[model samples]
Target: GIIASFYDSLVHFLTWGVFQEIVPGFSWIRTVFRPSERPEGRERLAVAQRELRRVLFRAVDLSAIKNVMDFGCGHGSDLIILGEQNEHLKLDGYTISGKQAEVCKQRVRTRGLQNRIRIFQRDSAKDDFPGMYDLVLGFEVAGLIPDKDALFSNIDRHLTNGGLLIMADFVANTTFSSTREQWNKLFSSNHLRLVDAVDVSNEVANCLHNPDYAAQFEALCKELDEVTQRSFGSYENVYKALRGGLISYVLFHVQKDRFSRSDELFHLNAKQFEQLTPYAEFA
Candidate 1:
C-alpha cells in the first residue's frame, strides 16, 4: 500500500500536470530505447518511446486477439494508443495508484475510448479480473512485485489458454558476458513458457545517455525530495547498470500453457537472429 501511494504521487508529478512541458511526452513512466540507428533528439523522444512500444506489440498477433489487459498501466499511455490503433479491440488497464487511475480515465475519455477502454483501480496480482483476456501485457511492472511466481499464477488465471504475454523489463544479476544458460536460469515462469528474449540493454542506455535527454532527467531528479528521489533512484540505477553491463533490458515473449505452433510468434529477421546466442532449450 505504501508503494501504491508513492506511485500515485509519481504519476501526478511526472505526467502533464508538472513535467508535461518540461519533458515533452514524458507521459509514459517506462524506459524508452532507440528503435532505429538514425539520429534522435529530445523532440523525438516521445515518438521513439511510441516506436519502442510498437516494437513490443509487433511480437503479438493482435489480429487473432479480441481483448487485452495491461497490468500496472501507469497513466494509461499504452492503453490510449491501443484503443486508437485497434477499433475492434476492447482494453482494460489495472493500476494500484488512485491518481494514475483518475488520470487514465480522463485520458480514455478524452480519446473517446470510454466504451472501449476500462481502467481499474486494483492490484492486478491480488484482485479478480472481470473476464479472461487473449493477451496480457506486463510491461516493466514485474520488478515491482515481490512474488513473481504468485503474480504469474494470477495472470495464468485470467489469461486464456495459449494466450500470449509480453514483457519489457530488466534482467538483473546479469553481465554482458553472461551466457544464455545463465540468463535463462535467472528468468523463468511456472505458468508460461519463454518464446523469445531480446537484449536491448545498450540501446536503452544509449537513449538515456543522449545529452539533452540526460539533462532533462537530471532536472526531474533534482526536483524530487529525498524519498521520491529514492523511488526515482531505480531509474538512475538502471541507467548505471546498463552502462556497466551489469544487467539487461530484455523484451520477453511468452505463451501460456498448451503452447502451440498455430499461435504466431514475433518474427526476427535473419540478421537479428544471427547476432545472438540461441536459448538452446526454448528455441
Candidate 2:
C-alpha cells in the first residue's frame, strides 16, 4: 500500500511538476526531473519550473481570462496556483488518467474549492468542454502528442476568440524537425499567433552533462531506482535524441487571434454592433 501510494504520488508530480521541464541526458534518475543551472541547490531548478506560469500570468488578463483550462493539469499544482493568483479565476483541468483525475479532484476539494474549478477525466483532445476558455494551458504535454494538429484543434474548440494557449515541452529539433514545422503550420491554420518561444534547452540540460555531473546523477538514480520498481526512466533516449538532433526544450506562448462571424461576428461593445463593416477594418 505504501509503495502503491508512493508510485501514484511520484507519477502525479513527475507528470506535472517542475521536474518535467528538465530533459536529461543518459544516466538520469527516474524520479528527479529537477534541473538546475546552479546544481548545488534546488533554487535554480525551481525558478526554471516557476517561470513558465509566471511569464504567462504576466500576459494573461486574470480578471478577463476568467475561464482558464489546463490540458494534462496533473494533480492541480498549476491550477491551484492559478486559483490563488486570482480569486475570480474559474479554472478547468483535463487529465487522461483516472487516478490522476481522482487526485486532482481531491486536491481541489482539499482546499475547499467549489465552483471555481471543474476537472475532466478524459482525453484532452477528445473531451467536450462545458464552456469555452479564454486561456488554455499546455504544460509539458504538447511535444508528446503524435497528432499535434488534433491537439491544437481541440485547443481551438475550448478557446474563445482571442484566447491564449501556453505550453512547455520538448521537440526533436533534428530528428523531428517536422514536429516544429507542423506546430507552426497548425498555429497558422488555427489562427493563433506566436507570442513567444523561450528556448530552455540549455537551462534544462545544464545538469545532464559529463564527469562530475554524471557521477552525482548515477548515484541518485541507483538510490531512487530501488525505491521505484517501475522500469520507467531512461536518459539514454534523451542523449540519443539529442545526438540525433531531435531534442530541445521550449516554452511556447500562443494566442488565438480575435475574429467576428455571423450574429456575434462584429461585437461592438457591452451594448453595440460594428456600424461600418468596411470602414473600421476591411481585412
Candidate 3:
C-alpha cells in the first residue's frame, strides 16, 4: 500500500511538473497545435507568425494597435512572436508565477527585443498597471482566474475604448456531458477542479459565441490527456490517484467594451452559483 501511494505521489508530481509547468512554461502547446516541418528557425517563426496571424490577428486591425498586454505570458513565447510580427508594437506581459516571469524576461533579452517587449511579475488580478493598452490578450491563461468577471472588469479598465481582448485557453464543449467519464479520468491525472464542459461552454457562449467552440474544447481536452500520458507514463495510474476531484478547463476571448464598468454586477441566482461551484467535501 505504501508503495502504491508512493507511486501515485510520484505520478502526481511528474504530471504537475510536466503538464502545468514545463509545457505551459515553454508554450509547447502552441507549437504542438501549429507544428512546422521547416528546418530553418526563420521558417519556423514564419509558420508561427502565419498561424498566429490567422488565428489571433486576422479579425483584428493590427495597423491601429500601439500597445499590447499579454496576461500570463508564460516564457514570453507569444510576446516574442508578437514582437517579431508587429515590430513597432509596444508589448507588456504579466505573470503571477515568478519562475515563469524570470524565464520570460531572460527570453526577451536573448531575443534582443528588450525595447519592444517587457515581462514583469504581477498578479493580474491585483496589480495596478501603468497605462491603457490597445490590445489585452491572454494566451491559454484566463481559465486559471478564479473570478472571470473581475478579470474582465480589470481588463476593461486597462484597455482603451474599442480595445481588443484576445484569449486562447482550454474550453469545454456542449457535449462534454457525454464524455464525463473520460474527463474525470483526465482530471484525476492532475489534481484539478472538476468543472464540466457544458458549464464552460455556457459561460463563454453567454459572452461570446464561437461556432467551433465544442470542437476546440474536445480537441484540447484530448490533446492534454494524450500529451500528459505520452510525456509522463500512464494515464490510468494518474487517474487512479486523482479520483474524486474536479474536472474542467476552458479558454476565453472576452472583449473589453469602451463603456465597460469598473465593477459591473453580474449576479447569478443561488441555484446557478451552486451549480457553478466545484463539488467538494470539507474535511
Candidate 4:
C-alpha cells in the first residue's frame, strides 16, 4: 500500500498534474538507451524512454490486436499513446493506487480518449478483471512483484488464446541459480510460450547514467518520506545489480499458446498434411 501511495505522491510531486509536459508518464525508473541516436543529456533520456516503449509496441503485430491491457499502468502515458495510435483498439489500464487511477482518468479525458480508454484502480495480481484482451503489458511492473507465479497466472486468465504479453523488467541472473529457472517454469505453467527474450541491461544502465535523469531521481528522493525513500531506494539496488551483472533487464515477448490443452499429440493442416504424408513413406 505504501508503494501505491508513493507512486501517487511521486506523480504529483514530479508532474504536479501536468505529467503530460514533464515525465512522459513513465513512473518506472529504468529506461532503454541508444547512443546511436546522437542526442545528448535530457533529450537523449526522453528518446531512450520512448524507445523503451517503442520496443514493446514493435514486439507484436498490433494490427491484429483489438484490445490491450496495461497491468501496472503508471499514469496512463502508454495507454494514451496506444489509444491514439490505433483508433480501432480499446484500452484498459490498471493501477493499484486510486490516486494514480484518478490522475490517469484525467489524462485520458484530456486526450479525448475517454471513449476508448478505461482506467481502473485494481491489483492485477488479486482482483478480477472484467474482460479478455489481445495484448497485455507488464512494463517494469513484474520487477516489483515477489510472487510472480500468481501474477503470471492472473494475467494468463485474462488473455485471449493466442494473445501476446510483452514485459520489460529485471530478472535475477545465474547468480540466483533457481530464481531464473523458476521464472521460466512459471511462464510454461501459465501456458505462456517465450517467443523472444532480449537482454537490455546495458541499455537500461545507460539510461540510468543520464545526469539529468539521475538528478531528477535524486530530487525525488529528498522529497520522499523514510518509508517511501526506502521503497524508491530499491531502484538503486537494481542499478547496482545491473552494473555487477548479477541481474538482467529483459524484454520478453510471450504468447498464450495453450498447446498442452489439446488432446492430439500433433496435428497438421491440409497443405502441411500432404507435404508431411509424402515424407512419411521414408518411415
Candidate 5:
C-alpha cells in the first residue's frame, strides 16, 4: 500500500524519461494509461502520412487546403512532418499541458516551422481556437478528451463545410475485463498505478476514475497491454518497461462531417455523455 502512494512519482520518472524521448511533449503516464501507440514500421508511418494526405486532399483537393489543426498535438512531430510535406499549408496544434506546449513551440522554432506549424497551450475542449481549418486531425487524442461529442461539435464548427476530422486513439474492445486483470498484475508488480485494472477502464470509458468503476476499466487496460506487447517487441524489457510505466499510448481515427444533422456521432448516449463532462474520480 505504501508503494501505491508513490505510484504517480514512479510513473512520472519512467514515463517522462522514455516517452518524451520518443513523442516530444507527451506525458508518458497519460499516454500509457490511454494506450496510444501504433505498430512500429516505416510502413505504418507511411500509411499514416498517406491517410493524412488523403484527408487533406479530400478537404480542399490539395492546393486549396492551406490550414491544418492538430488537436492534442503531442511533441509536435506530426506537425513537423505535415509542414515538411506541404510547405504552403499552415499548421496549428493545441494541448492542455503547459510543459508539452512549451516543448512543442521550441521544436517548431528549431525546425524553422515557426511560420508553418505552431502549437498553443490551450484546452481544446473549452477554448475557441482562432482561424478556420480545412482539416482538423487528432491523432491518438480523442480518448483523452472527456467530451467526445462536444469536442467533435467544436471540430465541426471550426472546420470548413467539407473539412475533415481525422482522429486516432484507443477504443474499448468487448473483451476488456479479463485483459485488465492481467494488466493489474503487471502494473502492481512494477509499482505502476495503485488502482486495479477495472477502475482504470471505467475511468477511460467515461473519462472518470473511481474504485467502483474498476471492473469496467480493467478491460481497456488489458486490451492496451495486449496491443502494446504485440506491437512493441515482446521482449522482457519491453514488458517490464510498460509495466513500470515507461510507455503509455493509444491509437484512434474519427472523422467529422461538416453537414451532419445528427448531434451525436460516436454512439455515446446522454447519460454516458453527462458522466464524462466533468472531471470524475481520476486522481
Candidate 6:
C-alpha cells in the first residue's frame, strides 16, 4: 500500500550496483531457455539479453548491421553483451531519466567501452536522434512512451533502409489483462515487417516469482523504512500480476522492408476509421 516516496527517481542512483545486481527484471529482458523448467538469477537476465540479441542477429545479416541503438536502454545493461559480441558495432543508448543515463554512463565508463558504446540522456520524442542505425532495439519500451506514432516514426527515421528492429516486453495476453493489446498495437504498426516473436512467459514470470529474488529484495528493503519499501514498487504485486497472466513477455523482431508501406492507402481512405467509428462492435 502507499510506500514512502523518497525521491523515487533517484532511488537507483542512490543504490547503484546493489539494485542492478539484484533487481534484473525491472530494467528489462526476458529469456528463451527452459533450464529447471525455469531459471532465475542476475545470470538469467544476462541470458535474455544475449537471447534478444540472438533474435536481432537472426532478423538480419549480422555483417549488414553496423550501427545499433537502444531506446529506453536501462542502465545500458544489455549494451555490455552487445559491446562484447560486436567490437566493430557502434552502440548508442537513449533514455529520458538522468539517473538511468548516469548509471549507464558509469557502466560504460567502467567497462572501458568508450570507443564502441555511448550513453545519451534525451527524450526520443522531442530530441533529435542520430540516424542511420542498421538495427534499433526497444526492449520493454513501447508501453512506456505515450505517443506510439512519434516513437516509431522517430525510429523509422533513424533506421537505415533495410534496417531491423528487435523488441522484448510483456504484452497483453488475455481479455481480462490490461496491458495485453497495448503491446500488440505497439508492434502492429508500419515501417517494419514483423519477423518472429517468441513467448518467454514462463521464463520471465519465474524470474519475478523466484524465492531468491523475493528474499533478496526483502532484505534490502528492510534497510529502509516500511514506507519506502512499500513504495519501492511492490514486487509482491508484480509477482501476482505476472502469475495472474495479464501480461506475457515476448521477444519480437521486425525488418525495415523497403516498399512495405509504399502502397499505403492514406489518400484512398478519405475517412479515418478512428474518427468514423468511435467504437465498433463485431457481430
Residue 170 Cα positional deviation in candidate 4, in Å, after optimal superposition: 1.2
- What is candidate 2's lDDT per residue for 1-283, written digit by digit as tens? 1112222323423432123234443223412444433353344334545754554354666777778888888878888877877888999888888988898888888876656988898776566656888888877665545566677778877788778888766544432243455456666666666665655444344434333454555665664444444333244344345444456555666777756332232121202111212111211
> What is the lDDT for 217 in model 3?
41
Ranking by lDDT: 4, 1, 2, 6, 3, 5
Candidate 4, residues 60-172: lDDT per residue as tens digits? 87778999998889888888888898898899988988989999999999989999999999888777666898999887676555566678888889999889998875556
The better-scoring model by lDDT among 3 and 4 is 4
lDDT of 6 by residue, 180-278 (tens): 333333334545555555555544445444445555565555544655555445444544654675544455666675564433422212122112110
List the candidates' TM-scores in order. 0.70, 0.69, 0.50, 0.72, 0.48, 0.66
The predictions' CA RMSDs to the true structure, in order, are: 8.8, 10.8, 14.0, 10.7, 15.7, 9.8
State which candidate has the highest TM-score. 4
lDDT: which candidate is best?
4
Q: Model-by-model lDDT, in order?
A: 0.60, 0.58, 0.47, 0.63, 0.46, 0.56
Q: What's model 2's lDDT at 154? A: 84
For model 4, the superposed segments whose C-alpha errors exceed 4 Å read 1-40, 175-178, 210-224, 227-233, 261-283
TM-score for candidate 2, residues paired by index? 0.69
Candidate 5 lDDT over residue span 170-190, tens digit each: 222222221223322322222
3 or 4: which has the higher TM-score?
Answer: 4
Weakest 10 consecutive residues, lDDT, candidate 5? 12-21
Q: After superposition, how far is residue 280 of candidate 6 from its true place, in Å?
A: 36
Candidate 4 RMSD computed on C-alpha atoms after optimal superposition onto the true structure: 10.7
Better of 1 and 4 by TM-score: 4
Clashes of each: 0, 5, 10, 0, 28, 3
Q: Higher lDDT: candidate 2 or 5?
A: 2
Task: Please state the error at residue 6 of candidate 4 in Å.
Answer: 13
